[PDB]
Structures are given as C-alpha cells and as structure tokens.
Amino acid sequence: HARSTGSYSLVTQQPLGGKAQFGGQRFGEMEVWALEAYGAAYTLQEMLTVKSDDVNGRTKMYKNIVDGNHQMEPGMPESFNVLLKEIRSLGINIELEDE
Amino acid sequence: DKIRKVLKIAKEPISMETPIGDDEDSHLGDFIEDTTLELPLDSATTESLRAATHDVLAGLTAREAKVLRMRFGIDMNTDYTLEEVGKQFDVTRERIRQIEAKALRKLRHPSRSEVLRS
Amino acid sequence: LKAQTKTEEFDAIKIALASPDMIRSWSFGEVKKPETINYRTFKPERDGLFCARIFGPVKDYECLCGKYKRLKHRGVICEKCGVEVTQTKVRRERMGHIELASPTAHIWFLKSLPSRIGLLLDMPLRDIERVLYFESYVVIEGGMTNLERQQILTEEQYLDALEEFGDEFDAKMGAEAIQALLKSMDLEQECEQLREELNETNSETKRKKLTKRIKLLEAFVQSGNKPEWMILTVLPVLPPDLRPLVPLDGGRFATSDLNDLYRRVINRNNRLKRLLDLAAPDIIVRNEKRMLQEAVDALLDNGRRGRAITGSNKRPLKSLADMIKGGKRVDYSGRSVITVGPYLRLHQCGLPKKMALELFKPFIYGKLELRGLATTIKAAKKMVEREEAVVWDILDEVIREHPVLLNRAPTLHRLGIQAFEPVLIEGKAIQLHPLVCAAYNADFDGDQMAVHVPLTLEAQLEARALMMSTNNILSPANGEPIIVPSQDVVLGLYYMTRDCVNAKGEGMVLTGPKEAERLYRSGLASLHARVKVRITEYEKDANGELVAKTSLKDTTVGRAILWMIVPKGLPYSIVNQALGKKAISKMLNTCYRILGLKPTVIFADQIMYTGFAYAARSGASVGIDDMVIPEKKHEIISEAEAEVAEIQEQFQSGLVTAGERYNKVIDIWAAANDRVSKAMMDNLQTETVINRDGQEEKQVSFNSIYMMADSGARGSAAQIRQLAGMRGLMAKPDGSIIETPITANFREGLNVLQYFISTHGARKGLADTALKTANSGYLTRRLVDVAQDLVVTEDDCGTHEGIMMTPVIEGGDVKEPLRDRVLGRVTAEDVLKPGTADILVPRNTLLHEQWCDLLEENSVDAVKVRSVVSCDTDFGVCAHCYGRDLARGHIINKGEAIGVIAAQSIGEPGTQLTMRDITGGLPRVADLFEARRPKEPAILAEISGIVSFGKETKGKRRLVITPVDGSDPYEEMIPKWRQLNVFEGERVERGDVISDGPEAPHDILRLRGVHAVTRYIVNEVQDVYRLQGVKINDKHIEVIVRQMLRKATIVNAGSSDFLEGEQVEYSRVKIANRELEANGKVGATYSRDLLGITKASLATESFISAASFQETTRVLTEAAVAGKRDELRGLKENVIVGRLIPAGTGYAYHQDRMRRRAAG
Amino acid sequence: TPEEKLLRAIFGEKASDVKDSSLRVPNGVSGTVIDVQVFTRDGVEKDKRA
Amino acid sequence: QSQLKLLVTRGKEQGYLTYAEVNDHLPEDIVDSDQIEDIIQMINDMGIQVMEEAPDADDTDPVRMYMREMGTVELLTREGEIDIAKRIEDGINQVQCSVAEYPEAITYLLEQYDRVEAE
Amino acid sequence: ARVTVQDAVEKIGNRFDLVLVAARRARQMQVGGKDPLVPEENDKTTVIALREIEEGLINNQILDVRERQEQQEQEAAELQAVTAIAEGRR
Amino acid sequence: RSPGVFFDSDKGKTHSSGKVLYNARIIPYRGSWLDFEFDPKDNLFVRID
C-alpha cells in the first residue's frame, strides 16, 4: 500500500480510503518514542500536524511541494482542537492565552 | 412506492459508536469518510487554473480581456450580461458578442487550458 | 504596545471552572428544540440540535433558504433567516448553549473519588450530599439559633424547627440549596479561622485533616474560581460536526449518541420549564428535577450509576467524558513485505517502482511542470496516471537524495526506524540491507515493514543526519556495534580462515593481492596451509599519521585475500589471523574506534560482500550424515539406567530416602545427559585425520554443523545436543520433571510418548513467549512515561561527587570479573595513582585511555566517576555527568533526549527475559524499579549505638532492640518471627545488618545513602541480565533512577510548609535562593525519598501530560478546580498539541521561546 | 468557478446536470472478465444486456 | 468497624488487587453500578494516604426514590373526590364573584365586545 | 555528507544545530537566491549545504553576518523610497 | 465446562498465610449458578448465580 493524499473521516480529519486509494499508515506511541530519541523535532512536527490531521496545513504544504518550496507552515491539528471543544463542552473551561 | 419511502424513515437509526469488525477497536463512525472537503490535488489544480487563466487573459487586448473577463464574470464577483457591458462600451449587444467570440477564436492553439480541461 | 486580539502564538494553556456567563461567551445561540433534521426535506430545524442560524451552514457559502448563494454576501446574514454565510467548517467550531430551569450538579465535581463539591463544603458525598439534593432531606444554610450551619433535617424536623423559629433561618433543599450553600461559603474568613483553630494545642491526632483541607481551601481560593460554578445553571452544547447525523448508504442515517443525550436533556428541561408555569404539584416537579439531573449527569459523563441506555442498542451511550477517556494515520506513507538485498549498500533500500511512484506523487508533479513535459499540474497527473516512461526518469531525479525511513512493527528502541536512500527496484516488495536486519529484530518469515517520506526540508536532513542507518553503527543500549555481520556473512568469513594442514598447501609465498590470482587459478587450495606472504601493515602513534611496516607473516589463502578488505589503519593480519566467530564484531569495533565513521561503513559493506560471496563459494550444506551421533550413546544410557535401576532396587528395600530419590535419579539422567553431550562434542569437534607430508595428524572437524556452531550463524550447544545427542530432562505441566528423559534425538526416531511429552514444553514455550513479549512493552510504557521529560541541558555543570565505580565482582566465592563499565565516562577528579599525578579532573575515559587503565596494573580497580544519579543540575542533565554512549563516538549532544533512549534500551532486551532467595527475570526487574518491599524485609540500625533488649515482649511484643549511644534512644520492633544476628551489649554502626535477609531499597536510600541505594538497584538489575546474557550499559539504569529519586521530604521549618513532600527541583533551586536572600533560617533541610516508577510518573507538572496515561477523569477535574496551567516544557504534552518537541532538533526553539517568555 | 465557466466556454460547455459513479477496476490489478450478473429491482425497466 | 477493619486488614495489599472479594462483604442491596467506582479509586494510585481518605468518606435510583414519596397514599373515595371537587368549584366561584365585583372587568368586556362587532 | 555528516558535527557541536543551520542554507538554495559554493555534480539541496559546512564555509555566524549585509543592502540601498514615505504622515 | 457439580481447589495463597479453602459449585445447563465456598474463619457461604 501507498498513499500520497486521499480522503479523510468526517469526525477526525485523518487519512482513510478503500474507495479509491488506501488509508495511510498509522504512527503511534512506539514510533514517537523513536523520533523523540533521535530528536527529529520537525519530522515529528510534520508527522503530527500537516502530514496527518491539519486541515489547512496539509493543503498549504502540498502547494509548497508542487512549487518546490517544501518548508511546512504548520498549525494546531484538529485532533486537539476537537479536544478543546469537547472539554469546553463541559462545565470546565480551557483557554490558550498568549504570553 | 409510498410504503417504500415509509420504511426509509423507520428506526433511530444506527449510531456511529457501534462495533463492527471488533478490531482494537472498531467503530462504525470511523469508516465514514468526509466528502465536503476537496482533494489537495484538486485544490492545487484550481489554484494553477487561476494562474493559468490569469496568464492567458494577458495575451489579449483591453477591449477583449475585459470583455471575456466581465462577460463570464471572473475576478469581479458579479457577472454581467451583454446589455450591462454593451452600455459601458458604447456599442450594444451583438458587437460585444463578436469580440467575445473572437477571443474564443484565439484560444485554439494553447495547450494549458486544453489539458486543464480533461 | 502589543495587545493583539487574534489567533497568534500561545505560550501556555489554562484550565479552570466556567461561569454561566463564561458559557454564554461561547454561545452562538440556544438550542431549544429536541428536533434535529427534517423528516422530509432533510433540512436543519429552527432551534434544534443542528440549527443553521446558531451553528453553521450546511453548504459552504449558500444559506439555508437560498436568498443568497455565492461569495457576494459572506459577511452579511440572510434576511429571511439569520444565517451567517461563511464556511461549512464553521459548523464544526460553533458552540451554543442550553439554559436549564432549576440548577444542576456537574457529575464530575460531584462524585469523582473526593467529593469536590463536598470536601470544599465539608460534607458526606453519597450519604448526605445525595439525600439533600435528590429531594429527600432538607439541609440548613446557616442558622443563628438552635440549628448549626450544615446539618441535615427531615420534613418533620423542618416544620418543627420552622414552627419553633422560622422566618429567620430559611434553608431550601435540592440543587439550588447546595448552590446557596456554596455561594454563602466564605473561603477567606474560613481560611483564617481554620488556620487558627487547626493549630491550637493538637498533636499528630489531628494534623492530617488540618493540613489537607487548609491547603485545599487555600488552593481553591487562590485559583480564582468561584464555588458557584460547581453546579452549572447553563450547559454548553458541543458542535454538530463533532456529533453529526450523516446519511450512510441508501438511507440509514448515522448519528452520535450525544445527540440522543442532548435530545433527552432538552426534553426533560423543557417539561420542567412548562411545569413551572402550569399546576405545580411538589412531587411531580421535584421528580422532573431529579430526571433533569439524570439527563445532565448522563450527558456529561455516563459512568457510573446504572448507565443510561435506549437507542435500541443494548450497549451504553458514549457520553462526552467517554470520548476523552481511555492511531494517528498519516499521509505520504506505505508498507509491504520485506526482502533481502545483498547487492545493496548500508545506506540504501529497495523501494518498489510503483510504490515509489505513488509516494512522491506531489514531487513528481512539481518536477514535471518544472522541466516542461506537462503543461500544467493536472497534465502531470494525467501524465503519471498514464505511466509514460519519461516520468520514471523524472522519478529517478526526485528520489535522488531524498531519504526514506523504514519502520518495523515491534518498535522496541530507537533503531526501530532508520532512514535509507531510495533505490528503484522492478518489483512489488521492499528490499533491505541484511546488516541492519538485526537492529530491526526482523526476519524474512513474511514480515512487512512500513515506509515514510520526510516531506519537510529540515525533516529530510533530520532523517539524513540522525535517522540515517550510517549514523547508527553502534547500539544506543551498549557501545558495541549493531550492524555487525550475522549468520551467512560470518559463516563465509569463518570459512575464509580455518587453517587446514596440507592439501594443495605448501609455503608458496607472494605479496598480498597477487595471492588472489593464485586462488582463482586453482592449483593451490584455500584453507592451507599455513603459508607465508608479505603483509604491508600500517600503524600510527603520538603524532598520528601513518607508519608503514612490511613483514613476512604465516597466514593462509583466505586471510591474505580477505586482508585487502581491511582499511588503511588497523593492526592488520592479526585481526584476520584469528577466524570468524565473535572477533568478527571485534574487528568492526576496533575499526570504528581507531579510524572513524565512513571507513567503518565501507569496511562493513566489504566484509558483507566478501562474506556472502565466499559463503556461496564454500557450498556449506546440511545433510543427514552431518550430525554424527556418538557410539558411546547406548553405552552411557545403559550405564545410567543401570545406576537408576540400582537406586530403584534400593528404594524397594528401604535403605535410601524414597522421599527424595526422585531428585538423585534426576542427577543420574542429568549427569548422563552431560556425558552424552560431552561425548558428542568431543567427537564432532576434532575428528579427521588428513595426511600431512608424512601423514597422521588431527585438527578440527569440517562437519558443516560444527562450522555453523563455531561461527555464530544460529547454532548453539544445546540445539546441537538435541540434534545428535539427546533431549534431556523434560518439563511436566505440574512443574515437576519426568524421570524418563528423551533418550532418542531428532537424528533418530522419536516415539509418540516422548513427543507427547515435549509438546508441553513447546506449548508453554510459545505461551510464555506470548506473555513476556507483551509484558516487556508493558514495562517499557511505565519506564518511558516516567523518564521522557529529562533532557541534557545547561552544557556541563560543576560538581565532582559521583558513584565510585568498581568492577562487579562475584569472585568473592565464584570468581567473575567485569571491568569495562568505565568508558566514555567523565572523571570526577584526578582519581589518584600509585605514586602521583596521572588522571586529570574532568577527563572523559577514552576508548584508548581506558586501555591505559591496564598499564596502572590490577592495583587500580576503583575510580570515582560523575553520573546522572548525582549532578547538581536543576531540570536537566549535565553533559559530562552522563557519558557518550551512542552510535556516536563523542559525548551526548546538548539537548538530546536521554529519557526515551534510556527507557527503550532497558525495555528492548525485555523480550528475552525468563519470568522466574532469587526471583529472577522480568518480574524481578519490575519489582526492583517499583521499589517494592520484600516479603521478609531485613532491618538496619538507624543510629550507631549499643544493642540491648527493650523489655522482653512487653506490648504487644515481640522483641525490641534499642541501639542507644551518645544521646537519645531508639525502639525498633522485632516480631519474634525470624531470628537475629547481634547479641546484647554489642555495638553497631549507622546502617548495620540485624536480620541478615532481603534488603529494602527504601531503607537503603533513607539510611545507607543515595550512592548505596543507586548502586544497589543497578548492581541488582544487572544481575538479572547477567544470567539472561543481555549486555546493557549502567548509564540508562542510572538515568531512570535519577528521576526515580525526583521528589523528597523536608523536615524542619522554612518557606515550604513542612509536611509537604516536594521534588528536589524546587527545593534545591529555592534553598540556593535563601542562604543569600534574607536568612538561612527561613528554610528547612530536605531528605531524599525513594518512590517507584509508577508513583514517580504519577506526579508531574503538566495536567495534559497527566491526562495522557493516568485516569483522565480525575486529573482533568482536580486540575480544573485549581486554576492550573501547562506552560509548557514537557515532551508528551507538547506532542498532542502538535508542535515542536522541546528536545533534539527543537530545544533551541524552546530555549529562545523560554527566554522570550521573561518579558511578560 | 468563473475560470472554469470561461474554460468550458472556450472548449464547449456540455455541462450536463449529471455526475459519474461508474464501477472501475482498482488501479494495480488486471485480468479477464469471466462472468457478468445483474440483479434488477422488482418493478424496474429491465436492461437490454440484462 | 466491620467495613473499615475488614477492608484495611485484608487489603495489604491483595497483591493483584483482588476486587471480587470485599464487595460481597458489604451490606445493603448489591449488584449496583454505583459502588463500583468507589473501590477501584481507593486501592491504588494515591496509596497509603488514600486508604485513610476512604473510611473518612465512608463514615441511589430515580424510580425507586419516586415511589418513595408516592408511597404516601392519602387515597380517596367517591365521598373524598366529590369533597375535593366541591372545594374546587367553591374556590372558582369565589374567584369569579370577586371578578364580578370589579366593574372595569365588565366595561372592558363591553369595550372588547364592541371591538368584536366592529371586526 | 551522503554518509556522515559525522564529519560535519565536529565542525559545529551537537548534530541538532548542524541540522538547523544546514536546513537554513538548504532553504536559501531550494527557493530564492541559489548560488552554491561547492560544485553541484547533480546533488539535491539537502546535501549541498552539508558539503559546504564540511568544506569549512557557510556556518552559523557566517549566515547571520551575510544576512546582516543582505539587510543593509536591501534597506540602505533603497532608502530613497522609504524616506519619501516618511514625509507621508509628516 | 461440563454441567453438573464439581469441587474446585483454590489451593495456595488466597489471603496470605495460605490454607486450602475448598469450594463446591453446581453448574446448570439452563438456570442460575449455585456455589458453596469456605472462608478463613471456616464459615460456609452460598453464591446464587
């Protein structure tokens, strides 16, 4: 199996297919251990955001690829923004203040 | 057929949190793909299309670029008709359509928009 | 003059309670109808759970009705229906709220271990706090006569007390009653009076609850949260997209359970609102309130009390909490079955053509449109979708120096993911280098690996400068090489030695490379003779460089030709003069330490190529006649059975103890097994006769199997002993051993009986394997969770103290030395010398300078070395104090990630640990790290004094020892059970043994010393790896034990509140800032405390990191109570947020941002 | 989108009010059709090939 | 006494956390999904001190608690029902009479009537 | 540096900063002002920066200083426009 | 597990100290479980289903 870019689930904007392509591979805890061990901060940075479930990030970075710019321009993944809305959905309030 | 449509309203129905394959662990709501989103490839092609068309209307004249641009309404939101453009360019209707047809005549050699079609 | 009001960069996130007005701030409308979607039009209702005006539009830019369609009105709402036409993702982020009638208690702050609403109010949970709000027993809200302030009354008591007084002590019941109860509560005045009362003439009979609540009350009042928010009056609503009802295939909608919950709570709340306007029967309305409580409690967090249901499913409904209490799929990835690739290098991998085509799709597109060919992006798509030859050439350009990292399923350590250079291979399988096939612990049984494509620029360099296979020469666990040649290659190089006498031999001398021409041209053999040749050696000394050294040594054909592979340096010949076994790795090791990286890599490729090639040339096979059975087998068996026959006959006529003759006869068969094993080995080893010149001589058998055994290549003594010898004593399901061992062997026939006996061993073998394989990772998780936060920082601090390193010697009564545990270690300070000078102060023991610790004779077997255990660092690890042990030869780079690498290295060999005064195995490791007290703990003398009996069994009691000397006595408690070791009158030292049994780590750390307890743990955890034969450096053990001693306990008087056990982090940083601040008397003295891995990991600053592993429902709630904030240096909590990790390639980013967050 | 409206206008609209969802053999595999089959609804115009 | 001494003395520390043990040594009605969480929360985690926070905290159902207050019968007969109904009509009558005293209610009825006839 | 990359770390300690600065230089080359120092020989921008660092040229202080000169060149050489804008709002 | 009744072991440490504590159990084909077990104090208890 191999996947450049395909569909995503409605609930969590994570890669999945089986209708035209193949749902991308799963990372997990075992792998993030290794990346932390190496120190590949940007590798894990992309692997956790744009490369996975960053709505605008994946597209912005894809455009950066076809233009031969690479870089990244990341953002907060929906798999954490959703968690904010879920916790905020309770009587408990969480905010992300600046400095 | 009325009865057919009736049975299409029965049941709650099913919830997403229903186990299916019993993996580790399966969930019906996890197989549902999103469709409101567009493919990144599709987005890139649309972007390149804007640049392509924005680069094609450069090889035209002002009284032809603006004509094709305004008639089919591009980069100006509200699209106008033959009358609203025929009044702003003196000669009304047919005249502005002639150029509108001539502009289309020019685009019979370039391959950019051709391949962008598909 | 900043103060920006946009979504910019955040330095921290805060967690706390939410006010009703705070909920209103998120409210983009109020859900008022249980309605979701229309039954016919399938259109969002007015004010339902899926409103368009409240939340977001269905379609992207067109409204509900259709008065407005395109981007013309993206900022203006619709006229007929107030629908803000923006995006459809808005429907995913819009909140909304429901405003309940009568107050409702939050299920979390109500019943979650401690009653947060109770403990803050000081009132029983499921006892009193239940009956007073479930409409049963009215409660008081402050009384100035007869009644107290928080007593519980019945309706009879209520009316009676109302008749006696009344109209001056009004106190309602139910939800709003508890609301007024918390609201009337004054945290400030209570904080004062509680501090006053709970300090007046009271010993240790009260101090517990006193200090507890006062710290809790102080925390809550300082938090900023008002106790009013404890029970909510306005319940917010989760966005529709996070709980949608999407139509599936051919009708049959699919909705979330939250919709059912919200629909129920909306219904019951509405009826409650309607009842408070119509006729108001007390029983009916109060019940509806209890029902409203049910709905709300079910929606917030089901748990927990019977479990709400409905929805046809017999299974419960996933509440809000259940969706956040308890794997990251990624684009640009793939996987396939792996295959050996001999012709490949050490930094290359076989990547399938079609596979690599789909992977670098976007890159191929851009490169195509860059050169030409494709007129546009879609042209490239249509050009690669129709694989048009030329595209492949473009592929050869994009994958040129674009590294791709491979990964195996069981990721134990860092070498689970290694990067390679992509090489196109006409096939659908992924080829891999057979050298790094050991680091993955991968076989070609059909195992499949995954591939990832480093998209980011710095991500590519990360994979090349860190995750590249060429940079991982040595194992992170042990300094020894990891890419060391295995079975096939080592067998080949073993065949390229093996000096055989005569047979086309003779001492025909030449000059190195010339000998190659001799080998291909036949005439001479290959394993002769020995024969002499001219070897041009190369050495360096002092001023480095190179010094030639031509000589005439007596090697062989194989050694001569193989010598060409050896790099410029090295002692030469003598590395080849040996053979192929374990020195095969030694040669690679020395090549690395004396030359460098690249030379070691190319040397590895050459020795692999050579090994494989000559291995094929050899043609070593495995026939049935290769495993020769001993002739004395039947003899030995008959003799053994004769002895056991005599023993059985003796047992028949009494004499010998029949109760344990079982054991001694086992010794008979066991001894017999050793006889057969020794006989087979002595036979299969030497043998042969040859015929040198005048014939008659002996070497060693060229018997294939033996060649495999005497050269690694998967072939051990036990296995061979079972092949030709015999399978010895077999295990029985009872746990006992059968007194009739497998006399036969695999070379011979096997009776049904003994095979039905061996099936037990195979069954329990696979079963135990399945257990310890998962149990190993089970331990790894705890190790990582507790250690994955410390990173080597602040370069190299001061301090000299450190554990005195000494060779682990069991040689006291068994003779077993190990003195390589000191290397790459930074010296404490000039560790003496039988005379003067020598060793410097902070000089790290080099690989060549550790061999200098042999020129100082066997006298010097003790050196003080800086370790991570000590180190006067604060929130990190001194570079010097750690070491250097990596795939790198130098010291650990500042800002690495010691924690995860340490944990991984520890839990890596966990797969090969046999679970069981010696427990032994993985369970022993777990118990040692958890710091658990033994089943029969020994006792020590806390203070050196005079041993004397303290009233013979006068309690209670049980003996009592009182070591008293100098000043003040001590009365320990001996429970009669178990004897002693010191008579009365005798004197003892500070920490002497007075039980001669198992020692407890807590007592060691508490009394003996930190160096002693750490030495104990490391030297006890190694002893379980010694038997298992798994090499692992002590550094990592010292690393986990470092933060294993994270917290302590202060006992005196200072700015810290005494009884509170706090970590030495804040302690040391605050004690240093008090001796020269105002006065050293405003601070106390601390005392280290030993706590297990689990207990240590339980405590952590970040509430998000805590919300990860441990119970989320608890940590999130308690962190909500006190206005806590993650800010924000942890690795784990910084991963789920999706940002740069505060380590490795990052760190510098976090360092800059950390200093940046000092202005305000 | 305006650009797409112009583009089709340059090469011919034919903007049918229909989409596409034809069953296509997945990319990678390839073989020979050995048997077709059609299960029609009870009350639907049967197909020619059916 | 019983619950405290049994829980503490037995669990030291039950090794594998033998849950299926003391839950039967507890009184009242069993097989509940309520007391389940209050035991898995005390055994581990905050060890030692938590075992002192349990007893101090130890020092139910909608329908069953609804039947409780409903238990107060106060049932009626034909005489009772008619009696209550009579009080109802008496109250209603007194109210309507009190409204009859109000002249502005009549004149307003007159005004709204002329509004009705005026359509 | 197709295989260490280890010969570059001893030129600037801690491989991590090596990755940062190398990624920095590679960022300059891939997009914007290219102009490599070491001959390309058909190699990606990924390795080109590493070869330069190995060669001895292009470090951290070097790039920062050249950035200072780059800023002083873009700003000071084109101040005639900014100064004319400074008189915009007095 | 075959229906009927059998006496289980439960031998070994079940409450420290270590002392047998045998127990009987009746397993129906279609009904409710009927167990009989001892305790450290040598009392007899019954478990219905």
Ligand SMILES: Nc1nc2c(ncn2[C@@H]2O[C@H](COP(=O)(O)OP(=O)(O)OP(=O)(O)O)[C@@H](OP(=O)(O)OP(=O)(O)O)[C@H]2O)c(=O)[nH]1
């Ligand atoms: N240390 C180092 N090596 C370099 C460098 N540039 C190229 N190489 C070597 O180039 C070798 C590969 O040569 P080729 O296979 O012909 O590829 P090239 O066409 O040469 O690319 P090129 O122009 O050199 O960059 C590798 O062989 P190997 O021997 O390593 O692979 P192994 O030991 O497994 O054989 C690299 O070591 C460099 O800047 N530093």
Ligand SMILES: [Zn+2]
């Ligand atoms: Zn509208």
Ligand SMILES: [Zn+2]
């Ligand atoms: Zn240090």
